[PDB]
């Protein structure tokens, strides 16, 4: 199998979601050694913002480049089986770095199509894992719109099989930060050894 | 009073939410002529993406400029009474243009502060109006995370008094597009003449 890892934190090597993504990779390589793993860091190698000129490209030099970057990202997504998405929460949303990727991957006739019975995703047979870190504690509450957003967006393009790994309470001190890292690594181990 | 209008569509003068924002302005000037109205188009005059270097600024030349742009935006927000936010839905989220504004307005000790009983907003006494356009029909359903996100983010910074104006079904043909424009202008008239 082929595993794609999407990093989106703006905190570099201090990132909680990056360090848990690197723990998922290390665990997958030890348990599955032949599988090919691709890491794409959307903070270190940023995707442009979807503006008026790019939504026309989906042509000028810059439209052409966005179209080809789009096509690249989509072929990469479709090439992989297991899609690991690091989704830190900033200001109640996902990171802009992740959002810009989504905005180039969502393409009519490519990653979804219109049907009589509504849009249907075209990125099929994938298993996703969301690693989502938060300062506070939102899970199953009204302030977590990241979780259902992710479900909705991934579901739209075809990715219905999504498992969530939460690391909450990071801002609450060393016992709660360690709880969040221990409970997210335990969740990660259950997925890697299922 | 002072009314701030935030445009965030990437569709320019073809924008549904821009044309309803311009209808709100025209209606407010005719009904309230002395009130000062400020329009800020976040697509025509973009706000940078929050990255690692900017989240440090909140210093390098570019950190200094982001800090001053932040301070500007926040003083502008706090200067106005009535905050009109055009929030088109792209890929189940708000526009990146709007998100980048939020990411520079949300500042600890400035637009919210930490308390014993949780964060509290510091932008007080405001009345917000969200004009939110969608191709499809999401209202009160599980695919509308934009509405509760907006409530949550605005509530966080202090803006608890939010009225939503929906323009849905834009993609459904001329009768449904006209329904959406007629029902959003009627909603706008009820707010302007309350
Ligand atoms: C710009 C910014 C905004 C934040 N917003 C929120 C938030 O809305 N809710 C929350 O619970 N924590 C918030 N946090 C804290 C992050 O969610 C927490 O630090 C998380 O570990 C980030 O993952 P990361 O280290 O992989 O970037 C924010 C942090 C940053 C830097
Ligand atoms: C990049 C892009 C993505 C879109 N995503 C969605 C969507 O997730 N859900 C929806 O119902 N409509 C969607 N639409 C349609 C817009 O919501 C609809 O055109 C709306 O009128 C946009 O407001 P605006 O004209 O002010 O930009 C999208 C349109 C664009 C351009």
From Swiss-Prot, chains A, B:
It catalyses: 2 a quinone + NADH + H(+) = 2 a 1,4-benzosemiquinone + NAD(+); N,N-dimethyl-1,4-phenylenediamine + anthranilate + 2 NAD(+) = 2-(4-dimethylaminophenyl)diazenylbenzoate + 2 NADH + 2 H(+). Signal peptide: none annotated. Its EC number is 1.6.5.-, 1.7.1.17. InterPro entries: Flavodoxin_fold, Flavoprotein-like_sf, FMN-dep_NADH:Q_OxRdtase_AzoR1, NADH:quinone_OxRdtase_FMN_depd. FMN binds at residues 9, 15-17, 89-92, 133-138. GO terms for cellular component: cytosol. One of its GO terms (biological process) is response to oxidative stress. Its cofactor is FMN. Disruption phenotype: Deletion mutant displays reduced viability when exposed to electrophilic quinones. The keyword Iron-sulfur does not apply. Induction: Expression is induced by electrophiles, including 2-methylhydroquinone, catechol, menadione, and diamide. Binds 1 FMN per subunit. Keywords: Flavoprotein, FMN, NAD, Oxidoreductase. The azo reduction activity is inhibited by dicoumarol. Quinone reductase that provides resistance to thiol-specific stress caused by electrophilic quinones. Can reduce several benzo-, naphtho-, and anthraquinone compounds. Also exhibits azoreductase activity. Catalyzes the reductive cleavage of the azo bond in aromatic azo compounds to the corresponding amines. Can reduce ethyl red, methyl red and p-methyl red, but is not able to convert sulfonated azo dyes. The stoichiometry implies that 2 cycles of the ping-pong mechanism are required for the cleavage of the azo bond. Can also act as a nitroreductase and is able to reduce nitro compounds such as 7-nitrocoumarin-3-carboxylic acid (7NCCA). NADH cannot be replaced with NADPH for both reductase activities. Quinone compounds are better substrates than the model azo substrate methyl red. AzoR probably does not contribute to dye reduction in vivo. Belongs to the azoreductase type 1 family. This is FMN-dependent NADH:quinone oxidoreductase. The gene is azoR.
């Amino acid at each position: 199998s082929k595993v794609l890892v999407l990093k989106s934190s703006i905190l570099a090597g201090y990132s909680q979601s990056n360090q848990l993504s690197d723990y998922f990779v290390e665990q997958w390589r030890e348990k599955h050694s032949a599988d090919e793993i691709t890491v794409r860091d959307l903070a270190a190698n940023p995707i442009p913002v979807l503006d008026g000129e790019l939504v026309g490209a989906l042509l000028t030099p810059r439209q052409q480049e966005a179209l080809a970057l789009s096509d690249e990202l989509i072929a990469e997504l479709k090439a992989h089986d297991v899609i690991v998405i690091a989704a830190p929460m900033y200001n109640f949303n996902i990171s802009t770095q992740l959002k810009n990727y989504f905005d180039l991957v969502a393409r009519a006739g490519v990653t979804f199509r219109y049907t009589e019975n509504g849009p249907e995703g075209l990125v099929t047979g994938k298993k996703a894992i969301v690693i989502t870190s938060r300062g506070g504690i939102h899970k199953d509450g009204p302030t977590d719109l990241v979780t259902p957003y992710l479900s909705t967006f991934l579901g739209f393009i075809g990715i219905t099989d999504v498992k969530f790994v939460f690391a909450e309470g990071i801002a609450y001190g060393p016992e709660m930060a360690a709880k969040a890292q221990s409970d997210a690594k335990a969740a990660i181990d259950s997925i890697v050894s299922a």
